[PDB]
Amino acid sequence: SYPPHMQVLLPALSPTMTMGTVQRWEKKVGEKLSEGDLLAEIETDKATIGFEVQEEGYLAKILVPEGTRDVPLGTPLCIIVEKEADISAFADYTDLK
Amino acid sequence: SYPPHMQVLLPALSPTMTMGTVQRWEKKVGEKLSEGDLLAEIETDKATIGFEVQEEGYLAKILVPEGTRDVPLGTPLCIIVEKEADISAFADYTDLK
Amino acid sequence: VPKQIERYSRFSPSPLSIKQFLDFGRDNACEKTSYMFLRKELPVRLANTMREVNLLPDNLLNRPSVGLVQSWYMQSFLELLEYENKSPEDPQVLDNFLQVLIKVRNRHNDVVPTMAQGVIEYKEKFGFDPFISTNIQYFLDRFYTNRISFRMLINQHTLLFGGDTNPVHPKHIGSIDPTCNVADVVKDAYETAKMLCEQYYLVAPELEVEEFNAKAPDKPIQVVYVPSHLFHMLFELFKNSMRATVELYEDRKEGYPAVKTLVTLGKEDLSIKISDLGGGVPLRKIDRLFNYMYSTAPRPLAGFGYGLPISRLYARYFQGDLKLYSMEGVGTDAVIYLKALSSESFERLPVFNKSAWRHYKTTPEADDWSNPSSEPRDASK
Amino acid sequence: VPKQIERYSRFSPSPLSIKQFLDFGRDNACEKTSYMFLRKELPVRLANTMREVNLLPDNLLNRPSVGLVQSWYMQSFLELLEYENKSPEDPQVLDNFLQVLIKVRNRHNDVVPTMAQGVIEYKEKFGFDPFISTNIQYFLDRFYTNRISFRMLINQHTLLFGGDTNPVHPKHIGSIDPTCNVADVVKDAYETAKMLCEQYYLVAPELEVEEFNAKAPDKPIQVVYVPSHLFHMLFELFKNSMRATVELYEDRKEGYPAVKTLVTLGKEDLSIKISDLGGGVPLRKIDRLFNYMYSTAPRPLAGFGYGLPISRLYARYFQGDLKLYSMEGVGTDAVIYLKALSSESFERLPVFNKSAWRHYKTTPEADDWSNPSSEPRDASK
Ligand SMILES: Nc1ncnc2c1ncn2[C@@H]1O[C@H](COP(=O)(O)OP(=O)(O)OP(=O)(O)O)[C@@H](O)[C@H]1O
Ligand SMILES: Nc1ncnc2c1ncn2[C@@H]1O[C@H](COP(=O)(O)OP(=O)(O)OP(=O)(O)O)[C@@H](O)[C@H]1O
Ligand SMILES: [K+]
Ligand SMILES: [K+]
Ligand SMILES: [K+]
Ligand SMILES: [K+]
Numbered sequence: 001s002y003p004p005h006m007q008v009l010l011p012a013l014s015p016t017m018t019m020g021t022v023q024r025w026e027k028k029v030g031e032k033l034s035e036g037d038l039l040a041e042i043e044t045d046k047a048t049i050g051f052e053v054q055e056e057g058y059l060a061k062i063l064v065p066e067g068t069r070d071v072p073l074g075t076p077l078c079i080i081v082e083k084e085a086d087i088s089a090f091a092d093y094t095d096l097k
Numbered sequence: 098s099y100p101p102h103m104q105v106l107l108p109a110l111s112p113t114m115t116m117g118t119v120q121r122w123e124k125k126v127g128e129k130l131s132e133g134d135l136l137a138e139i140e141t142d143k144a145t146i147g148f149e150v151q152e153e154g155y156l157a158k159i160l161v162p163e164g165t166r167d168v169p170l171g172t173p174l175c176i177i178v179e180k181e182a183d184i185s186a187f188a189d190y191t192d193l194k
Numbered sequence: 195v196p197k198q199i200e201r202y203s204r205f206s207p208s209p210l211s212i213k214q215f216l217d218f219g220r221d222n223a224c225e226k227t228s229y230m231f232l233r234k235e236l237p238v239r240l241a242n243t244m245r246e247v248n249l250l251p252d253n254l255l256n257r258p259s260v261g262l263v264q265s266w267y268m269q270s271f272l273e274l275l276e277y278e279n280k281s282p283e284d285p286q287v288l289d290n291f292l293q294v295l296i297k298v299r300n301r302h303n304d305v306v307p308t309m310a311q312g313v314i315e316y317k318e319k320f321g322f323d324p325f326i327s328t329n330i331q332y333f334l335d336r337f338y339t340n341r342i343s344f345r346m347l348i349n350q351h352t353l354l355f356g357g358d359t360n361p362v363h364p365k366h367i368g369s370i371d372p373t374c375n376v377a378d379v380v381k382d383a384y385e386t387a388k389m390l391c392e393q394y395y396l397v398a399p400e401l402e403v404e405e406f407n408a409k410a411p412d413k414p415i416q417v418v419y420v421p422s423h424l425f426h427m428l429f430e431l432f433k434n435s436m437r438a439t440v441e442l443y444e445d446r447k448e449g450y451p452a453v454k455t456l457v458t459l460g461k462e463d464l465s466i467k468i469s470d471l472g473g474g475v476p477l478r479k480i481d482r483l484f485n486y487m488y489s490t491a492p493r494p495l496a497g498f499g500y501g502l503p504i505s506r507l508y509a510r511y512f513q514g515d516l517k518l519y520s521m522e523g524v525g526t527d528a529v530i531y532l533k534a535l536s537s538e539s540f541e542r543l544p545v546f547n548k549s550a551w552r553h554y555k556t557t558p559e560a561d562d563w564s565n566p567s568s569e570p571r572d573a574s575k
Numbered sequence: 576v577p578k579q580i581e582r583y584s585r586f587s588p589s590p591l592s593i594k595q596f597l598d599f600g601r602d603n604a605c606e607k608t609s610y611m612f613l614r615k616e617l618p619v620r621l622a623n624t625m626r627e628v629n630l631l632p633d634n635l636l637n638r639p640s641v642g643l644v645q646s647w648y649m650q651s652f653l654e655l656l657e658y659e660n661k662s663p664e665d666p667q668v669l670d671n672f673l674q675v676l677i678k679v680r681n682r683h684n685d686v687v688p689t690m691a692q693g694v695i696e697y698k699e700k701f702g703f704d705p706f707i708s709t710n711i712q713y714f715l716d717r718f719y720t721n722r723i724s725f726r727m728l729i730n731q732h733t734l735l736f737g738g739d740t741n742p743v744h745p746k747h748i749g750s751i752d753p754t755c756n757v758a759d760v761v762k763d764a765y766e767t768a769k770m771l772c773e774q775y776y777l778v779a780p781e782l783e784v785e786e787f788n789a790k791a792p793d794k795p796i797q798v799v800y801v802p803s804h805l806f807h808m809l810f811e812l813f814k815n816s817m818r819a820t821v822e823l824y825e826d827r828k829e830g831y832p833a834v835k836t837l838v839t840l841g842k843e844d845l846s847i848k849i850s851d852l853g854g855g856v857p858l859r860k861i862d863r864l865f866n867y868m869y870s871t872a873p874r875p876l877a878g879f880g881y882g883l884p885i886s887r888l889y890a891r892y893f894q895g896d897l898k899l900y901s902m903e904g905v906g907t908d909a910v911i912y913l914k915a916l917s918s919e920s921f922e923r924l925p926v927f928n929k930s931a932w933r934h935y936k937t938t939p940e941a942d943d944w945s946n947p948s949s950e951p952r953d954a955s956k
């Protein structure tokens with residue numbers, strides 16, 4: 001199937017956030033990601049939040065394009081993989097241990 | 098004997114430098130070192146140069162204390178090791194492959 | 195309870211504009227709404243700060259005083275968290291919540307001096323290096339900025355819903371004044387500085403005030419603002435100016451130049467320039483004037499070294515700024531910039547995230563730009 | 576030959592003080608010594624820059640113009656390296672070396688505009704993001720600072736040993752003036768700006784100059800300096816002031832306020848403040864005034880957007896600075912700070928090392944401090 005991968009879900013980035021606009025992507029498909037890099041500007045009602053990568057890897061696919069308003073909590077925003085050979089395998093869209 | 102280790106020699110940091118004052122140490126015995134971290138201020142006749150670590154490891158021993166004026170080129174300034182268990186082995190002073 | 199701290203420290207603060215405070219207070223004023231906001235916002239802001247205090251060097255974290263601040267914040271945090279699942283529909287909740295706000299504010303009365311003793315204790319007892327110095331600076335700006343912000347929030351709620359039918363400043367909206375006359379706050383800040391300067395120096399310069407309202411030429415300059423913040427900045431700049439002037443001229447025959455205030459209003463900025471002929475400061479020293487506890491007074495009007503950086507926090511808090519320019523040998527200009535428009539006056543709040551963490555776990559880096567030797571070669575041979 | 580670049584790029588530049596230039600020229604003036612220094616220093620400085628130009632985004636590196644600059648630098652570098660093992664004892668060497676310096680300088684005549692076309696070509700042809708913008712900024716400040724420095728070095732040698740027994744400025748030391756009268760350079764810079772403003776606007780403000788020599792009260796203010804650098808900064812600030820004033824008042828009845836220059840001298844600083852009543856600039860915009868090619872002129876006196884950042888490079892080059900403070904709705908102060916003491920006036924030079932590399936391979940980080948929503952919740956319900 002697909003290789004080991006993680007889906008980044010949109011969290012409640014504020015105690016009352018229920019949705020957010022994906023204002024800008026800060027990483028490009030194919031770029032390395034370390035714990036804490038800036039991934040995206042998420043705009044709400046209350047702030048423009050810098051969303052940080054919580055897990056190190058590589059950006060495989062963006063599921064939710066820039067500009068998409070009103071993305072609900074829990075929406076997969078994008079896909080992370082463990083090695084950069086595994087990116088190409090996601091062009092057309094439990095061993096993470 | 099001692100474990101695999103590297104001696105940091107004082108280079109010609111300027112085309113005409115022949116000696117330098119070890120003005121300050123910027124890393125402490127036992128601290129991690131990545132390629133390019135600041136290791137020491139070397140003062141000459143012409144400048145106060147920030148000497149950068151050229152090789153990643155751990156600082157095991159300082160051979161030349163802060164304040165030592167007129168250190169000739171090629172003087173071992175300190176010792177680097179590959180793992181932080183190997184530090185204690187240098188308290189009292191070819192597999193680097 | 196540290197998981198609660200982790201979690202709330204990861205939430206982003208919700209910066210509010212003066213407009214919002216004013217529109218909420220004037221047009222709305224729903225106690226329920228305020229409660230829903232604060233019971234969540236306060237813990238977020240507190241947790242963001244606590245996370246940072248935890249990153250301080252262990253030798254500072256170790257001082258009794260820093261421990262006290264931590265426990266106070268922790269006690270406040272825990273006390274607000276009791277409300278996360280309490281219904282605003284019950285009036286009792288609302289009422290006790292108000293009491294809790296009062297309580298936390300009183301507890302937070304000592305915080306500014308306690309942290310100061312904290313770092314003073316530390317600076318004088320442990321050796322001090324510049325890596326750690328700019329770090330304490332960075333921490334303190336942020337830590338005190340949040341304190342300003344909690345106090346702002348708590349003040350709005352208590353002033354609004356405290357139900358005090360005898361308010362000190364009737365036409366205000368909490369602590370916001372919709373028509374703050376700027377020259378009046380300048381005059382007050384000045385008279386109160388004069389008093390203190392006159393008490394010790396037996397003399398004080400005169401104030402001269404001038405205005406230019408480019409927005410509408412002959413009209414007095416008014417802005418929507420928190421008067422006490424404006425007052426504080428002015429007071430503090432005036433004490434500096436008076437000291438500088440009086441000290442320079444006490445051995446002269448010239449007699450004392452005035453302290454000149456120019457207040458201007460444009461499309462975007464309200465600018466207030468305080469000018470003195472107090473001798474100025476060499477360029478090399480301008481930045482450090484803003485270090486906590488940098489002082490040239492006997493360690494008079496001066497001593498603590500808090501006046502300039504704290505004043506600059508009040509200015510930056512609502513998207514303004516405070517800048518200083520000197521001509522060494524003559525005098526100094528100190529300029530407060532405010533937003534003209536309340537719709538543009540957003541809280542500027544410290545966020546704990548990886549960027550902040552990085553500031554605390556930085557490490558000296560090589561200089562970018564050259565430095566000369568402390569003993570350069572004598573080019574005379 | 577890239578190993579030679581690697582190696583020299585790893586050497587540190589040797590910053591020189593005005594004192595050293597002056598002491599060398601006055602008391603010493605040994606051609607051999609200068610040659611031993613320059614044959615090594617020039618390649619170091621060149622290699623430090625080339626290493627940085629190589630780190631530019633590929634789409635900028637790709638422009639014909641950037642390639643040209645690279646090859647020019649490479650050609651110069653290779654031409655200086657021919658001397659590393661040539662004896663100063665032979666007079667021929669000395670002589671040809673002088674010719675080589677002249678040659679490289681002429682070749683480096685076009686460099687400033689060629690790089691400008693470079694980045695203009697790029698900014699307008701490829702989309703532009705702020706990560707890459709502050710990077711180009713950082714590169715350009717450094718790249719142009721080295722250019723100032725090569726020219727400084729080459730000028731000293733050629734003026735000193737060019738053997739020209741008919742020198743334009745006889746009592747100078749190369750291009751250094753031991754008694755540069757500051758108000759005279761102010762007046763000259765002003766008259767020459769006036770001419771240009773008068774030519775297009777049919778009118779120009781008057782200059783008023785004032786001095787205060789705290790060092791020695793009635794005495795004219797003199798400093799040891801490169802007059803042409805001082806001239807350049809002043810010229811550029813005056814054109815800005817004249818434009819701002821003339822544009823504001825062309826529709827008024829008031830008649831044109833003067834441009835006021837205050838020149839002061841203290842223990843450490845020589846300060847020059849140029850003040851205009853030309854309407855000022857809102858705080859939000861002050862930083863970007865210093866971006867290469869930020870301009871509000873039809874894209875008159877203005878257009879390029881180089882005047883302010885280049886002037887600030889001249890100021891920072893010898894440990895001075897150039898700062899701007901506005902009161903939006905009235906006018907602006909532009910202040911040049913120089914070192915009073917030549918012994919304190921060291922070259923400030925870009926060093927290529929890991930710190931620099933890091934600036935080019937940075938990556939957007941989360942903001943430290945909060946930002947509001949572009950559409951905040953209407954607090955009116
Ligand atoms: N207008 C001024 N002219 C000259 N020097 C000034 C001026 N304002 C500030 N300074 C310098 O900056 C220093 C610190 O300023 P600051 O107000 O922060 O602390 P303090 O006045 O020294 O004590 P306090 O905490 O009550 O303000 C002063 O001691 C003084 O050296
Ligand atoms: N004294 C001033 N008053 C108001 N605005 C100013 C002043 N000085 C500079 N500015 C603003 O800064 C901008 C850029 O300044 P700068 O001199 O760098 O470029 P330019 O004047 O626009 O063209 P040039 O390259 O020849 O200088 C100006 O277009 C103007 O908007
Ligand atoms: K946070
Ligand atoms: K201070
Ligand atoms: K270098
Ligand atoms: K510009």
Ligand SMILES: [Mg+2]
Nearest residue numbers: 433434496501
């Ligand atoms: Mg003070």
Ligand SMILES: [Mg+2]
Nearest residue numbers: 814815877882
């Ligand atoms: Mg210009």
